[PDB]
Amino acid sequence: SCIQFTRHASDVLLNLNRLRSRDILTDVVIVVSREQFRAHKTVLMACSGLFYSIFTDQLKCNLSVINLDPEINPEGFCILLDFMYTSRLNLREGNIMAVMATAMYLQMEHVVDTCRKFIKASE
Amino acid sequence: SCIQFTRHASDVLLNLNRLRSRDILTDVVIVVSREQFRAHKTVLMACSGLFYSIFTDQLKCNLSVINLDPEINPEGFCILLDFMYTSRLNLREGNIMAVMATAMYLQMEHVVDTCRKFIKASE
């Protein structure tokens, strides 16, 4: 018999992004080819199968720095981190291959799906 | 020129609630008349003007335990904590006064608004 507030999830995500932009309560640095990205472990876990596996590990859950595979493109990661905190994906002809490869590595199934669809349309 | 994934914010909140239910990466205990509630500081801040003010304070941001005012009803808090993580509010004739009072104290404006409206309809 609950009532539901339609905009609540979007408002929560908007506030989490405001905290990220002001570097409030960020608890991890993600290192991508020497580029550094500060974030909240819980948000990373909520969006990515890879971060979910990492931060549920009894040793890695306590790390303040995570280094990604050197093949990962920092721009592709940045676009995906922005998507995690906003639901908005900056998908462009020039970045789609790097974004799809990064989403496959991060295990972000819905992003992989739209990249596959956009690539298929261009062939 | 971004594309947007409609269900992303809801999916993020659903995963944050899954972490809460399994007590994963919870970093604070909220004490309400001896009842204890584990949660994520970022989610509490994203939903409540009171928690936002508390955890942006340079001393309180580091506390692992927060004690609420003794007038706060634990059931009212529990219903609001559930709403924070799900967008669903269990509003009932028997709890509406405690829920509204707790939402006013927590500074959850949209919850206060619907409680005021539901009370006005019954008079």
Binding site: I3, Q4, F5, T6 | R88, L89
Partner: peptide
């Protein structure tokens, strides 16, 4: 607010 809605009935979910």
């Amino acid at each position: 607010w809605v009935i979910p």
